[PDB]
Amino acid sequence: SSYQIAVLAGDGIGPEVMAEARKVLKAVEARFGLNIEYTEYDVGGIAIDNHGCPLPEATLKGCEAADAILFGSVGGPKWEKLPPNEQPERGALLPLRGHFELFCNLRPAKLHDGLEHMSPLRSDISARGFDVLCVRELTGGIYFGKPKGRQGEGESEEAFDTMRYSRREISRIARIAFEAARGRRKKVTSVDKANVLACSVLWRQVVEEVAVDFPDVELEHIYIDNATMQLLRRPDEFDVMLCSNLFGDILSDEIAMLTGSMGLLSSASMNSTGFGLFEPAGGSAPDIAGKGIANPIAQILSAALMLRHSLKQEEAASAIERAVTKALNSGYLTGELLSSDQRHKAKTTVQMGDFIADAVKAGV
């Protein structure tokens, strides 16, 4: 029936790229006869300014009434020096994840045709190309373990965080990774520190238990330090990476940077009943905000994940995805995607959204 979306554009480039995502969405709504209602709520820095905290009660309620959250980016210099537990990025994201039980974080990263030169990889490695999906457990591990805090005074004052996982937690994220691999290149690389950590011993054990249900997918295990090395050297040999919360945080970023095109990457944070939060992979980039040069593709593709994962509108999702392909292969690139000699061909944020929306409309 009529879908409800909580729009949380946040700070920096968030509102301007969100404008483009909504534009593209309007095209898909008209194409596929979707009936989607949107309500905007403040989150992050803007919420701190307007409401005194990064996740207002009305913002959370708004998300509880919605079928999905379409999320921009949060954070900036203006709030850097608040204490950590008042800061906008953590203060928005972790409580949304915890509250909605968004245990599943999906961050695909692919090296795009014709953008190899932007990859910080050596030209022969970037030429091989890569497509690595990071599947990261998002509501457990050391992010939410207790006890957490500090005790004591002076030299002996101590702080502490507890990484913990139960079998139930590990197997649910593992199944997501294996099921993803099934539809990709049939390999899961589980990434842990089982040589040091008791949580990792249990992780590696349970992922191997889950594997029995996927005789068709290869499973291998790698330690997180070695994975940072191998992703640099041979990223083409990984398909899906399965990670705990802290490890997937680290690895997903490394892989995104290896593309050299983070403005093209999006992410999906999902619970088990199809609600999720859909955001670009990269930050609020305050240094470029309000200028018309931010790449809106990550936000536009977030909207495509929203349509697929939460709204069960796979053709509309795929239409946005192909409209993005058409831009990228028809000379519609923003400045950060272009070599410095080709910079003068750069499209503005609005030109991008107008091109993408027009392709959806033309039946791409």
Ligand X SMILES: CC(C)[C@H](C(=O)O)[C@@H](O)C(=O)O
Residues tagged active-site: 143, 193, 225, 249, 253
Is 225 a binder of ligand X (CB under 6 A)? yes
Q: Is the peptide bond before 147 cis (omega within 30 degrees of 0)?
A: yes
Q: CA-CA distance, 242 to 246, in Å (whole number)?
A: 12
Least distance between Mg ion and beta carbon 4 (Å): 28
The residue with its CB nearest to ligand X is 89
Least distance between ligand X and beta carbon 89 (Å): 4
Binding segment (CB under 6 A) for ligand X, from list 86-94, 184-192, 256-264, 344-352: 86-94
- Type of residue found at 199: C
Is 196 a binder of ligand X (CB under 6 A)? yes
Q: CA-CA distance, 235 to 253, in Å (whole number)?
A: 13
Positions touching a second copy (CB under 8 A) are: 84, 87, 89-90, 94, 119-123, 125-126, 142-143, 145, 148-150, 152, 154-168, 171, 193-202, 224-226, 228-229, 232-233, 246, 249-254, 256-258
Tokens, residue 228: 């940072």
- Type of residue found at 305: L
Contact 335, 296 (CB under 8 A): no
Least distance between ligand X and beta carbon 243 (Å): 12
The full DSSP string for 25-64 is: HHHHHHHHT--EEEEE---THHHHHHHSSSS-HHHHHHHH
Give the x/- contact pattern for Mg ion in 221-240, rule: CB under 5 A. Answer: ----x---------------
Is 99 a binder of ligand X (CB under 6 A)? no
> How far is the CA of 19 from the CAs of 15, 16, 27, 297, in angstroms?
6, 5, 13, 11
Tokens, residue 321: 């995805």
Tokens, residue 100: 């909605």
Who's near 276: CB < 8 A, 6+ residues apart?
68, 69, 100, 102, 268, 269, 270, 305, 306, 309, 310
Contact 117, 336 (CB under 8 A): no
Is 195 a binder of ligand X (CB under 6 A)? yes
Tokens, residue 143: 């992010």
Q: Which of residues 238-257 bind ligand X (CB under 6 A)?
A: 249
Q: How many residues would you count in the chain?
A: 364
- Residue 88 annotated as part of some ligand binding site: yes
| Binds 161: which of Mg ion, a second copy, ligand X, none (CB < 5-8 Å by kind) | a second copy
Tokens, residue 237: 């040999």
Contact 179, 239 (CB under 8 A): no
- Residue 283 annotated as part of some ligand binding site: yes
- Binding residue count for Mg ion, defined by CB under 5 A: 2
- Binding residue count for ligand X, defined by CB under 6 A: 8
Is 195 a binder of Mg ion (CB under 5 A)? no
Is 327 a binder of ligand X (CB under 6 A)? no
Least distance between a second copy and beta carbon 216 (Å): 24
Q: Which residues are annotated as a binding site?
A: 76-89, 97, 107, 136, 225, 249, 253, 283-295
Q: Which residues are annotated as a binding site for substrate?
A: 97, 107, 136, 225
**Residues binding ligand X (CB under 6 A):** 89-90, 93-94, 195-196, 225, 249
**Residues binding Mg ion (CB under 5 A):** 225, 249
